[PDB]
Every structure is written in structure tokens, then in C-alpha cells.
Design an enzyme around this catalytic site. Structure first.
Site, PDB file in Angstrom:
ATOM      1  N   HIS A  58      -3.834   0.816   1.559  1.00  0.00           N
ATOM      2  CA  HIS A  58      -3.807  -0.486   1.107  1.00  0.00           C
ATOM      3  C   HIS A  58      -4.953  -0.989   0.003  1.00  0.00           C
ATOM      4  CE1 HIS A  58      -2.974  -4.830   2.786  1.00  0.00           C
ATOM      5  NE2 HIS A  58      -3.098  -4.819   1.444  1.00  0.00           N
ATOM      6  N   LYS A 112       1.320  -0.795   5.265  1.00  0.00           N
ATOM      7  CA  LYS A 112       0.147  -0.230   4.489  1.00  0.00           C
ATOM      8  C   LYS A 112      -0.875   0.223   5.586  1.00  0.00           C
ATOM      9  CE  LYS A 112       1.208  -3.849   0.950  1.00  0.00           C
ATOM     10  NZ  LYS A 112       1.567  -4.871   1.558  1.00  0.00           N
ATOM     11  N   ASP A 117       7.855  -6.321   2.295  1.00  0.00           N
ATOM     12  CA  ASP A 117       6.604  -5.820   2.211  1.00  0.00           C
ATOM     13  C   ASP A 117       5.679  -6.339   3.199  1.00  0.00           C
ATOM     14  OD1 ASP A 117       4.694  -4.160   0.125  1.00  0.00           O
ATOM     15  OD2 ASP A 117       3.612  -6.283   0.842  1.00  0.00           O
TER      16      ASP A 117
END
Ligand SMILES: NC(=O)c1ccc[n+]([C@@H]2O[C@H](COP(=O)([O-])OP(=O)(O)OC[C@H]3O[C@@H](n4cnc5c(N)ncnc54)[C@H](OP(=O)(O)O)[C@@H]3O)[C@@H](O)[C@H]2O)c1
Ligand SMILES: C[C@H](C(=O)O)c1ccc(-c2ccccc2)c(F)c1
Length: 316
Positions: free
Chosen positions: A114, A81, A47
Site C-alpha cells: 500500500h 492492499k 479496489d
């Protein structure tokens, strides 16, 4: 093999993800070593985000581990993101392309909006005027979403989702005329002091996966997080469970999420803890243990991002 969940677009997400954000005082070089160690330890889900300012390093980790034969690209699930300076629809693809250039990867497995509050375009991630005011921008997020959908039809993002969305903003996407792809996920704060049951149930009813961040009680970086907030991992119930299972409070908090149907992230840049966190797959919690953890819920949100409060899309 490794544990994954089927997303609403048919792609698969590993249920344990490696978080990569570290506060600014931590050198970037640490991201490279940490992601390599994560992959070594058996993380298959990584991530990141443009705003983390680590994609060159995280991308090099990934590439290195593919190039040395440790892993195949198909067995890495990489998330980036879209930062809020690129919400305008014509800026969405360029932001993804820029991430991919920094990464030197061909695609991301998942691209998220995001944060729902928009800011003015440009290089600066938190653009401010001469008096320090954040320069907010007015953008229709359903247009941002259409631009995300196109990134997916182009193959640049295998799946698309959101982050830090509330019930109203999700409904806004889901009820959009001409919607092509639902969000696969909503990545939000979630841990035993903020267990998001209501929003979890909503997402389940829509086959959206909730992905839990700050699942171990957050990086606690000031001024983003209040230092007077309780320390999740010092919780006496979590510590007693840990002792009972010969595990750690972290592992209890991660296992909790898995059993309730949540995909869980965990950041560590410490070799020992990276290896420990994958032990979440080695044990199980009884119904009574899970209920005890449900009982810790206290409506404690660590990450308010309240520098972005004021505009209507502020989600909290
Ligand atoms: N979408 C968003 O808006 C958003 C927001 C926040 C977070 N995220 C993502 O979620 C990730 C995780 O959230 P988070 O960074 O706030 O941190 P978190 O995973 O809750 O972790 C908090 C702290 O736990 C420590 N830790 C890790 N494993 C441990 C263990 N086994 N025992 C004891 N301590 C342990 C880490 O220190 P060490 O590194 O020293 O081990 C870390 O500082 C981020 O890195 C980012 O990828 C996304
Ligand atoms: C909340 C989000 C996340 O942690 O994913 C996030 C992370 C980092 C920043 C951030 C942006 C500029 C300087 C320092 C931090 C930010 F504005 C938002």
C-alpha cells in the site's frame, strides 16, 4: 465482455475500477450498497484495502452478487492492499489471510504494498507512542516483496503490485537479485492536474501498468488533503469538453486516462454517478482534446500522506 489489459504476469485487469474508500464519518453500510450498485452498473474491478476498514462489507457485496447469479467470481477483479504495519516478511501472508477471512473470498486478484513507509506491527494501523509520534519500523521492502511473491505462488493473490512507489523504489524492486515477479502495477495519484507523464513513461518502459487513484480530484478528506487545493472537476477546460461531448467533467477525466494507457479508478457511493462513470466506454477524445488535457498539468499532488514523511522510503 468488458475492456481489460494484459498484465506482465499474463493476468487481465479491467481498465475501469471501483474505488471503495470513504471518510470515517460515512457509515460502513454504505460500502455494501455501493459495491452492489457498481457491479450492477458493470464495474468488474473493485479496489479496497485493509486500512479502509470495509472489507467485511465489500466482501459481502461480492459474495451476494455471485450467490444471486449476477456475476461469476472469474468476472470480478478484486484488489486488496498490505498495510504498513505488516511489511515484515513473516507478517505479509498473515495480513493477506486476514483480509481474505474478512472478505470470505478465497483469493484476491491483486495484492499491493500500500505505502512504502513501514510502521510497528500490531492491530493499530497508525501506531503512536505516548507522545503521539508515529512508531516507524525499519523493513527491507525487497524482503516484503519476496513475501508477496510467495503469496502469488500460493495462489492467494493472482497478481502482485505496488502503490505509491517512486522511480527509486520501483528500481529497487526491479533490480533485486533473484526477482521472480515484477510488480504488475504501480497504483498512484493521477489526474489532469498531476498527470505523472514521467512516471507513466517509466512504468510503460517496464510493462508496469499505472493505476490512477484520485482520478476525479480525490475524496478531499481533511486533514489528508489541503482544502485550498483547486477542485479538479471545476476546471474550465474539462467543463468545456464535457459540454461539447454532452458528458461530464468526471467522464472527461476518466476517458483521458484510458486513452493514455492508464487503468483508472473512480469512487462514488451515489447511484446516479456510479452509473454515469461506466459511460467512459461510450465516447472518445480526439488528439487535440487529449493535448488540451495534457496542458492542464500543474504538479498539484492532493494526497501527500505527509504524516509518514521523514523516513528514507517516504516516496514524495
Ligand atoms: N493506493 C492509495 O494510496 C490510494 C489513495 C487514494 C485513493 N485510492 C483508491 O482510489 C479510489 C478513488 O480515489 P478517491 O477516493 O480519492 O476519489 P476519486 O475517485 O478521485 O473521487 C472523488 C469524488 O468524486 C465524486 N464523484 C464520483 N463520480 C463523480 C461524477 N461522475 N461526477 C462528479 N463527482 C463524482 C465522489 O463523490 P460521490 O461518492 O458522492 O459520488 C468522490 O467523492 C479510492 O476509493 C481508493 O479505492 C488508493
Ligand atoms: C492513503 C491510503 C488510501 O487512501 O488508500 C490511506 C487510507 C486511509 C488511511 C487511514 C488510516 C487510518 C485512519 C484514517 C485513514 C490511511 F492511513 C491511508
Amino acid at each position: 465482455k468488458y475492456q481489460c489489459v494484459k498484465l506482465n504476469d499474463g493476468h487481465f485487469m479491467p481498465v475501469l475500477g471501483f474505488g471503495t474508500y470513504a471518510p470515517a464519518e460515512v457509515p460502513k453500510s454504505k460500502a455494501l450498497e455501493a459495491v452492489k450498485l457498481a457491479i450492477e452498473a458493470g464495474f468488474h474491478h473493485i479496489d479496497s484495502a485493509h486500512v479502509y476498514n470495509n472489507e467485511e462489507q465489500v466482501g459481502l457485496a461480492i459474495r451476494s452478487k455471485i450467490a444471486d447469479g449476477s456475476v461469476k467470481r472469474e468476472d470480478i477483479f478484486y484488489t486488496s492492499k498490505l498495510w504498513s504495519n505488516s511489511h515484515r516478511p513473516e507478517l505479509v501472508r498473515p495480513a493477506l489471510e486476514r483480509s481474505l477471512k474478512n472478505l470470505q473470498l478465497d483469493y484476491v486478484d491483486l495484492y499491493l504494498i500500500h505505502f512504502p513507509v513501514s510502521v510497528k506491527p500490531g492491530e493499530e494501523v497508525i501506531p503512536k507512542d505516548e507522545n503521539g509520534k508515529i512508531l516507524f519500523d525499519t523493513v527491507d521492502l525487497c524482503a516484503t516483496w519476496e513475501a508477496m511473491e510467495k503469496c502469488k505462488d500460493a495462489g492467494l493473490a493472482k497478481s502482485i503490485g505496488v502503490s505509491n512507489f517512486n522511480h527509486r523504489l520501483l528500481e529497487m524492486i526491479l533490480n533485486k537479485p533473484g526477482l521472480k515477479y515484477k510488480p504488475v502495477c504501480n497504483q498512484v495519484e493521477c489526474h489532469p492536474y498531476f498527470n505523472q507523464r514521467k512516471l507513466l513513461d517509466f512504468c510503460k518502459s517496464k510493462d508496469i501498468v499505472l493505476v490512477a487513484y484520485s482520478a476525479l480530484g480525490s475524496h478531499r478528506e481533511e486533514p489528508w488533503v489541503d482544502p485550498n487545493s483547486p477542485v479538479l472537476l471545476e476546471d474550465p477546460v474539462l467543463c468545456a469538453l464535457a459540454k461539447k461531448h454532452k458528458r461530464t467533467p468526471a467522464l472527461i477525466a476518466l476517458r483521458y486516462q484510458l486513452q493514455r494507457g492508464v487503468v483508472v479508478l473512480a469512487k462514488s457511493y451515489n447511484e446516479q454517478r456510479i452509473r454515469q462513470n461506466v459511460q467512459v466506454f461510450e465516447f472518445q477524445l480526439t488528439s487535440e482534446e487529449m493535448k488540451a488535457i495534457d496542458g492542464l498539468n500543474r504538479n498539484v499532488r492532493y494526497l501527500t500522506l505527509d504524516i509518514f514523511a521523514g523516513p528514507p522510503n517516504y516516496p514524495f
